[PDB]
Design a protein around this ligand. Sequence first.
Ligand SMILES: Nc1ncnc2c1ncn2[C@@H]1O[C@H](CSCC[C@H](N)C(=O)O)[C@@H](O)[C@H]1O
Ligand SMILES: NC[C@H](O)c1ccc(O)cc1
Length: 257
Amino acid sequence: ASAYQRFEPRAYLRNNYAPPRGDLCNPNGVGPWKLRCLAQTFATGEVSGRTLIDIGSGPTVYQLLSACSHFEDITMTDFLEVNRQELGRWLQEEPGAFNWSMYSQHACLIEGKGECWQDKERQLRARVKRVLPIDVHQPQPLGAGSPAPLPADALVSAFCLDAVSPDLASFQRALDHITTLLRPGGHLLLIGALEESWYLAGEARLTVVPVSEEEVREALVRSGYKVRDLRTYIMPAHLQTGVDDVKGVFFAWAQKV
Ligand SMILES: Nc1ncnc2c1ncn2[C@@H]1O[C@H](CSCC[C@H](N)C(=O)O)[C@@H](O)[C@H]1O
Ligand SMILES: NC[C@H](O)c1ccc(O)cc1
């Protein structure tokens, strides 16, 4: 965990959201696959409400694009100050923000509502009310009196739990912890790495718990979810680049009983 004290948001973005993994042109790439899942899922319209919270946003916004059109109050979170700062730069259109436009575009491409991408980005930026510090290891991750409407109508998290838990159990408790933020009946949209054991972010070298699909199923079940959809994307040869050892990527649409 103290390893996260050397994490570099720029180097992370560059490693995971710039070419090649971030060249969205090939539909068989991982960025399209993620966006498509998110988009397909909301497009069902069974996932809806007023508030929503993103767990462990890090410096990234893509996980929220298709989403932001179904929830008026969006809360973003991360454990580091430096990421919350990077998010800020893009939320306020400040100088040196990261360019998510190619993502917004595909968001718009995939949803098929003929929306323009500036509209999408504007809708997001407006609906993100607050960026909050968070620790998923605490039994009350946000703290005591968090400015976040609780309980949330849904949650979204990508590459967080799997990335901050040393081992399976640690993962499992982390899940329990955030599931407390989710209203009963609410939805969890979860994305993470499959059989990833490390990944770089500049000077930082994070050690991670290589999870599998069945392990993710069993763990959502244990935390009290009905698994509505669980899908697996296998990382293709040319997307393996020595910033990590990830083998595939999972997406899960879970409902709290
Ligand atoms: N104890 C903790 N609780 C919640 N998040 C934590 C955490 N420790 C580290 N993190 C955060 O987990 C994030 C993992 S990187 C994932 C970022 C983004 N959701 C993605 O789609 O890429 C990092 O930003 C890191 O700061
Ligand atoms: N745990 C993060 C890992 O490096 C990662 C993050 C995002 C991806 O699209 C693929 C892999």
